[PDB]
Design an enzyme around this catalytic site. Sequence first.
Site, PDB file in Angstrom:
ATOM      1  N   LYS A   1       0.816  -1.199   0.000  1.00  0.00           N
ATOM      2  CA  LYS A   1       0.000   0.000   0.000  1.00  0.00           C
ATOM      3  C   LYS A   1       0.874   1.284   0.000  1.00  0.00           C
ATOM      4  O   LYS A   1       0.366   2.378   0.309  1.00  0.00           O
ATOM      5  CB  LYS A   1      -0.910  -0.028   1.168  1.00  0.00           C
ATOM      6  CG  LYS A   1      -1.944  -1.434   1.133  1.00  0.00           C
ATOM      7  CD  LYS A   1      -2.242  -1.659  -0.313  1.00  0.00           C
ATOM      8  CE  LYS A   1      -3.494  -2.916  -0.531  1.00  0.00           C
ATOM      9  NZ  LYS A   1      -3.893  -2.564  -2.025  1.00  0.00           N
TER      10      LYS A   1
ATOM     11  N   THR B   1       2.840   0.272  -4.894  1.00  0.00           N
ATOM     12  CA  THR B   1       3.646  -0.722  -5.594  1.00  0.00           C
ATOM     13  C   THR B   1       3.329  -0.763  -7.087  1.00  0.00           C
ATOM     14  O   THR B   1       4.249  -0.713  -7.934  1.00  0.00           O
ATOM     15  CB  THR B   1       3.476  -2.120  -4.982  1.00  0.00           C
ATOM     16  OG1 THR B   1       3.551  -2.016  -3.546  1.00  0.00           O
ATOM     17  CG2 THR B   1       4.579  -3.072  -5.488  1.00  0.00           C
TER      18      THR B   1
ATOM     19  N   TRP C   1       1.783   1.424  -8.923  1.00  0.00           N
ATOM     20  CA  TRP C   1       1.976   2.679  -9.588  1.00  0.00           C
ATOM     21  C   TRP C   1       3.434   2.818 -10.032  1.00  0.00           C
ATOM     22  O   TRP C   1       3.715   3.163 -11.186  1.00  0.00           O
ATOM     23  CB  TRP C   1       1.557   3.843  -8.668  1.00  0.00           C
ATOM     24  CG  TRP C   1       1.629   5.261  -9.319  1.00  0.00           C
ATOM     25  CD1 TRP C   1       1.569   5.564 -10.661  1.00  0.00           C
ATOM     26  CD2 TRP C   1       1.715   6.531  -8.635  1.00  0.00           C
ATOM     27  NE1 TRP C   1       1.629   6.934 -10.854  1.00  0.00           N
ATOM     28  CE2 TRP C   1       1.732   7.550  -9.633  1.00  0.00           C
ATOM     29  CE3 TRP C   1       1.788   6.907  -7.284  1.00  0.00           C
ATOM     30  CZ2 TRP C   1       1.843   8.913  -9.320  1.00  0.00           C
ATOM     31  CZ3 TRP C   1       1.871   8.280  -6.977  1.00  0.00           C
ATOM     32  CH2 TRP C   1       1.900   9.255  -8.001  1.00  0.00           C
TER      33      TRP C   1
ATOM     34  N   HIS D   1       7.582  -7.386  -1.247  1.00  0.00           N
ATOM     35  CA  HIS D   1       7.209  -6.766   0.026  1.00  0.00           C
ATOM     36  C   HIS D   1       8.030  -7.388   1.178  1.00  0.00           C
ATOM     37  O   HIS D   1       7.683  -7.198   2.345  1.00  0.00           O
ATOM     38  CB  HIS D   1       5.699  -6.986   0.368  1.00  0.00           C
ATOM     39  CG  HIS D   1       4.740  -6.575  -0.698  1.00  0.00           C
ATOM     40  ND1 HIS D   1       4.689  -5.294  -1.199  1.00  0.00           N
ATOM     41  CD2 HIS D   1       3.694  -7.240  -1.262  1.00  0.00           C
ATOM     42  CE1 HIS D   1       3.754  -5.214  -2.116  1.00  0.00           C
ATOM     43  NE2 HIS D   1       3.113  -6.376  -2.159  1.00  0.00           N
TER      44      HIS D   1
ATOM     45  N   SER E   1      -5.274   2.639   3.340  1.00  0.00           N
ATOM     46  CA  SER E   1      -5.337   1.982   2.036  1.00  0.00           C
ATOM     47  C   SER E   1      -5.543   0.492   2.174  1.00  0.00           C
ATOM     48  O   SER E   1      -6.388  -0.091   1.502  1.00  0.00           O
ATOM     49  CB  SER E   1      -4.061   2.259   1.249  1.00  0.00           C
ATOM     50  OG  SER E   1      -4.154   1.667  -0.028  1.00  0.00           O
TER      51      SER E   1
ATOM     52  N   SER F   1       0.531   6.717 -16.959  1.00  0.00           N
ATOM     53  CA  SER F   1       0.633   6.221 -15.581  1.00  0.00           C
ATOM     54  C   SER F   1      -0.280   6.984 -14.608  1.00  0.00           C
ATOM     55  O   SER F   1      -0.199   6.797 -13.403  1.00  0.00           O
ATOM     56  CB  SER F   1       2.072   6.256 -15.098  1.00  0.00           C
ATOM     57  OG  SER F   1       2.625   7.590 -15.123  1.00  0.00           O
TER      58      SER F   1
ATOM     59  N   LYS G   1      -8.352   6.095  -4.032  1.00  0.00           N
ATOM     60  CA  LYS G   1      -8.431   7.541  -3.988  1.00  0.00           C
ATOM     61  C   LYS G   1      -7.225   8.176  -4.663  1.00  0.00           C
ATOM     62  O   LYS G   1      -7.358   9.109  -5.407  1.00  0.00           O
ATOM     63  CB  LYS G   1      -8.609   8.048  -2.524  1.00  0.00           C
ATOM     64  CG  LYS G   1      -8.950   9.578  -2.372  1.00  0.00           C
ATOM     65  CE  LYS G   1      -6.358   8.775  -0.576  1.00  0.00           C
ATOM     66  NZ  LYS G   1      -5.471   7.899  -1.304  1.00  0.00           N
ATOM     67  N   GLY G   2      -6.049   7.655  -4.409  1.00  0.00           N
ATOM     68  CA  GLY G   2      -4.893   8.029  -5.191  1.00  0.00           C
ATOM     69  C   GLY G   2      -4.279   9.320  -4.775  1.00  0.00           C
ATOM     70  O   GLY G   2      -3.622   9.991  -5.579  1.00  0.00           O
TER      71      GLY G   2
HETATM   72  C1  LIG Z   1       0.107 -14.996  -6.644  1.00  0.00           C
HETATM   73  C2  LIG Z   1      -1.286 -14.662  -7.167  1.00  0.00           C
HETATM   74  C3  LIG Z   1      -1.365 -14.967  -8.674  1.00  0.00           C
HETATM   75  C4  LIG Z   1      -0.500 -14.072  -9.570  1.00  0.00           C
HETATM   76  C5  LIG Z   1      -0.420 -14.615 -10.994  1.00  0.00           C
HETATM   77  O1  LIG Z   1      -1.360 -15.319 -11.434  1.00  0.00           O
HETATM   78  O2  LIG Z   1       0.592 -14.348 -11.697  1.00  0.00           O
HETATM   79  C6  LIG Z   1      -1.731 -13.216  -6.832  1.00  0.00           C
HETATM   80  C7  LIG Z   1      -3.115 -12.840  -7.404  1.00  0.00           C
HETATM   81  C8  LIG Z   1      -3.729 -11.809  -6.435  1.00  0.00           C
HETATM   82  C9  LIG Z   1      -2.573 -11.480  -5.488  1.00  0.00           C
HETATM   83  C10 LIG Z   1      -2.893 -10.795  -4.172  1.00  0.00           C
HETATM   84  C11 LIG Z   1      -3.562  -9.462  -4.424  1.00  0.00           C
HETATM   85  C12 LIG Z   1      -3.865  -8.772  -3.105  1.00  0.00           C
HETATM   86  C13 LIG Z   1      -2.615  -8.549  -2.242  1.00  0.00           C
HETATM   87  C14 LIG Z   1      -1.785  -7.401  -2.832  1.00  0.00           C
HETATM   88  C15 LIG Z   1      -0.584  -7.114  -1.966  1.00  0.00           C
HETATM   89  O3  LIG Z   1       0.163  -6.028  -2.533  1.00  0.00           O
HETATM   90  C16 LIG Z   1       0.265  -8.387  -1.918  1.00  0.00           C
HETATM   91  C17 LIG Z   1      -0.509  -9.575  -1.325  1.00  0.00           C
HETATM   92  C18 LIG Z   1      -1.836  -9.866  -2.042  1.00  0.00           C
HETATM   93  C19 LIG Z   1      -2.695 -10.820  -1.191  1.00  0.00           C
HETATM   94  C20 LIG Z   1      -1.581 -10.532  -3.418  1.00  0.00           C
HETATM   95  C21 LIG Z   1      -0.656 -11.766  -3.344  1.00  0.00           C
HETATM   96  C22 LIG Z   1      -0.453 -12.455  -4.701  1.00  0.00           C
HETATM   97  C23 LIG Z   1      -1.797 -12.781  -5.346  1.00  0.00           C
HETATM   98  C24 LIG Z   1      -2.583 -13.796  -4.473  1.00  0.00           C
HETATM   99  N1  LIG Z   2      -1.586   6.228 -10.699  1.00  0.00           N
HETATM  100  C1  LIG Z   2      -1.704   6.307  -9.373  1.00  0.00           C
HETATM  101  N2  LIG Z   2      -1.530   7.511  -8.696  1.00  0.00           N
HETATM  102  C2  LIG Z   2      -1.614   7.584  -7.372  1.00  0.00           C
HETATM  103  N3  LIG Z   2      -1.890   6.521  -6.626  1.00  0.00           N
HETATM  104  C3  LIG Z   2      -2.083   5.299  -7.136  1.00  0.00           C
HETATM  105  C4  LIG Z   2      -2.021   5.099  -8.571  1.00  0.00           C
HETATM  106  N4  LIG Z   2      -2.285   3.806  -8.804  1.00  0.00           N
HETATM  107  C5  LIG Z   2      -2.480   3.214  -7.599  1.00  0.00           C
HETATM  108  N5  LIG Z   2      -2.371   4.128  -6.602  1.00  0.00           N
HETATM  109  C6  LIG Z   2      -2.570   3.934  -5.152  1.00  0.00           C
HETATM  110  O1  LIG Z   2      -1.621   3.090  -4.521  1.00  0.00           O
HETATM  111  C7  LIG Z   2      -2.263   2.426  -3.399  1.00  0.00           C
HETATM  112  C8  LIG Z   2      -2.079   0.917  -3.513  1.00  0.00           C
HETATM  113  O2  LIG Z   2      -0.691   0.598  -3.426  1.00  0.00           O
HETATM  114  P1  LIG Z   2      -0.088  -0.850  -3.769  1.00  0.00           P
HETATM  115  O3  LIG Z   2      -0.003  -0.901  -5.275  1.00  0.00           O
HETATM  116  O4  LIG Z   2       1.225  -0.677  -3.062  1.00  0.00           O
HETATM  117  O5  LIG Z   2      -0.975  -1.799  -3.150  1.00  0.00           O
HETATM  118  C9  LIG Z   2      -3.738   2.843  -3.466  1.00  0.00           C
HETATM  119  O6  LIG Z   2      -3.895   3.969  -2.587  1.00  0.00           O
HETATM  120  P2  LIG Z   2      -5.239   4.472  -1.836  1.00  0.00           P
HETATM  121  O7  LIG Z   2      -5.741   3.311  -1.105  1.00  0.00           O
HETATM  122  O8  LIG Z   2      -4.633   5.589  -1.004  1.00  0.00           O
HETATM  123  O9  LIG Z   2      -6.151   5.027  -2.917  1.00  0.00           O
HETATM  124  C10 LIG Z   2      -3.892   3.282  -4.910  1.00  0.00           C
HETATM  125  O10 LIG Z   2      -4.929   4.225  -5.098  1.00  0.00           O
END
Ligand SMILES: C[C@H](CCC(=O)O)[C@H]1CC[C@H]2[C@@H]3CC[C@@H]4C[C@H](O)CC[C@]4(C)[C@H]3CC[C@]12C
Ligand SMILES: Nc1ncnc2c1ncn2[C@@H]1O[C@H](COP(=O)(O)O)[C@@H](OP(=O)(O)O)[C@H]1O
Lengths: 282, 282
Positions: free
Chosen positions: B41, B44, B46, B96, B126, B215, B245-246
């Site tokens: 969060k 990543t 982005w 992560h 987030s 982007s 929300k971004g």
């Molecule tokens: C390994 C899986 C398949 C990927 C593929 O098919 O190539 C993917 C699909 C959805 C993914 C989860 C999405 C939510 C979470 C995001 C967070 O930033 C990291 C953890 C989180 C739980 C992810 C882990 C990896 C998952 C389970």
């Molecule tokens: N183009 C962009 N600009 C700004 N924030 C972005 C974005 N794309 C994704 N994000 C934000 O990055 C967070 C998710 O991060 P990750 O990819 O690390 O899981 C979310 O924040 P919010 O929950 O604050 O909206 C998401 O909105």
Amino acid sequence: DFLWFEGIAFPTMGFRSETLRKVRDEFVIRDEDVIILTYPKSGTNWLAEILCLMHSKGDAKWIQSVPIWERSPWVESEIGYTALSETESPRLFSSHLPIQLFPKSFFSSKAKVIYLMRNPRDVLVSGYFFWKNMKFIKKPKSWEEYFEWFCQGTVLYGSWFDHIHGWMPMREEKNFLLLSYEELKQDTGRTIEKICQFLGKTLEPEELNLILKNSSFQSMKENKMSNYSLLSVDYVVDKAQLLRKGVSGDWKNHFTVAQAEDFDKLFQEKMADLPRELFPWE
Amino acid sequence: DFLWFEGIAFPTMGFRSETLRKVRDEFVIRDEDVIILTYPKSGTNWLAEILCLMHSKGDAKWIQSVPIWERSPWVESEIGYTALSETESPRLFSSHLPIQLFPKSFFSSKAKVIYLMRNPRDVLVSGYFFWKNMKFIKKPKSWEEYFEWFCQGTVLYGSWFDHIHGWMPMREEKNFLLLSYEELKQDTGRTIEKICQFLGKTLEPEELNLILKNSSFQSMKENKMSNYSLLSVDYVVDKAQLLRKGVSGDWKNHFTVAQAEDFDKLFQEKMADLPRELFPWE
Ligand SMILES: C[C@H](CCC(=O)O)[C@H]1CC[C@H]2[C@@H]3CC[C@@H]4C[C@H](O)CC[C@]4(C)[C@H]3CC[C@]12C
Ligand SMILES: Nc1ncnc2c1ncn2[C@@H]1O[C@H](COP(=O)(O)O)[C@@H](OP(=O)(O)O)[C@H]1O
Ligand SMILES: C[C@H](CCC(=O)O)[C@H]1CC[C@H]2[C@@H]3CC[C@@H]4C[C@H](O)CC[C@]4(C)[C@H]3CC[C@]12C
Ligand SMILES: Nc1ncnc2c1ncn2[C@@H]1O[C@H](COP(=O)(O)O)[C@@H](OP(=O)(O)O)[C@H]1O
């Protein structure tokens, strides 16, 4: 017959005039592209395999699992023209196009081209034996007829003398490397080092050793992806034969003294305007 | 339920103790790798999308045709671990992992890592909203319960405070770039230029402008590949919601004043041994 486009002969399979026109006029060269430039039968596949192996620091995983003509496709071909625009950088690819047919887009780009030249007496011999199992190439009646075709330039990709004339001006450009099959063969490691430095890469001793090992005539001969054994029967009769002998100097086993005297005179007449030191042989 | 490995919680799906061991111990980092390191969060996806776009010089062809998690796999996930061994260089991928769980192999390599750091109050929020639609995450009873988990570190990937402490010592290494979501959001163009200089790349003004265009929060929200809309329904209820929300600063809309004061106290007690100039908030 051949497909004729801009005075150059092209194979009757895998090529279209409309594509070759877009290749020159529309195809986009990226600054990150590495391009192999050969007159056909000068070591194109050798150098592609070295390049694929520099890229993987000697690891043969990808050269043994991907066909060599997908790893370094022919941009002028339909399948290669089409595949390359869908391919992410860094792209490696090949071409036998004379300068005037090469994507115009390259000349304003920083793309790196490696031009590989070879003794045309050897290219002549190499081609002579290769074309035989190819179903879709016009075959000479005899060694003597092919010899005369080659000397006149009426062969796939035109004259060797022309190819060479038209690319040589680039030898002074920073993104053009001039190699010879002879020097590659004589000192493969030194040559690979030359290619690294040009491409701005370094290799560790162990990695170079493994690229030497894995790009050998025999590794390539034994590698299904690299030896042309995967060609369709639509393209070829029996098998291969890409990996025939793999040396310099085989022309002496095939030219007669009289053929040799004629080529010398022909070569000397056509290459008068270029510096002799440019040509490693002989 | 979480998968617990080395005192750090991992998702119930997609992860295995055995793989995670090999990730630390056996997975091979190449010097050509570009790796994004985040606490979940921090932005990543982005960063991933920006990097993909820097690679294609603004050209959205590949971000619109390939799922973002395949363009930048999680090395620690089973699918990621496996897919990456088979991938040719240059590899882009995400992690992560706290430092002590990261491929040991990295530490003798010249691979470039980009650490992206974000206000953990914003990270808290987030994640709070994100986890709700996910079928395989243990969900909190309340805003308050989740607040307590996050502060204690008993959330996926452990403590933010620990993650940060682990990785910060690297900030002095040539192959380490430290960024924040806040600076990325406040001056995107300039941040991208900072990444370029880090990665040894140049972009033309027109290319930057296209990466900025492509982007954007809205482009990504609209892109089927980038917005999680493709996730199997064996993973999520409803859809998304990656693109919420971004902005930064949204935590103010959710923290009560009492929570802000408690979090301030905690952040102050935990981050005391690190220079405050390091955290661009607030
Ligand atoms: C390994 C899986 C398949 C990927 C593929 O098919 O190539 C993917 C699909 C959805 C993914 C989860 C999405 C939510 C979470 C995001 C967070 O930033 C990291 C953890 C989180 C739980 C992810 C882990 C990896 C998952 C389970
Ligand atoms: N183009 C962009 N600009 C700004 N924030 C972005 C974005 N794309 C994704 N994000 C934000 O990055 C967070 C998710 O991060 P990750 O990819 O690390 O899981 C979310 O924040 P919010 O929950 O604050 O909206 C998401 O909105
Ligand atoms: C484009 C075609 C399909 C590729 C694919 O399916 O990806 C390939 C398959 C076999 C190839 C020919 C092989 C022999 C010759 C080599 C010489 O160096 C150049 C010419 C030569 C006649 C080639 C041209 C391209 C061909 C026809
Ligand atoms: N690993 C290797 N070492 C040396 N020569 C090689 C080689 N692989 C291919 N070649 C040679 O390169 C020529 C074919 O060139 P191209 O790649 O342009 O089609 C053939 O020459 P000979 O027919 O002289 O043996 C072939 O044997």
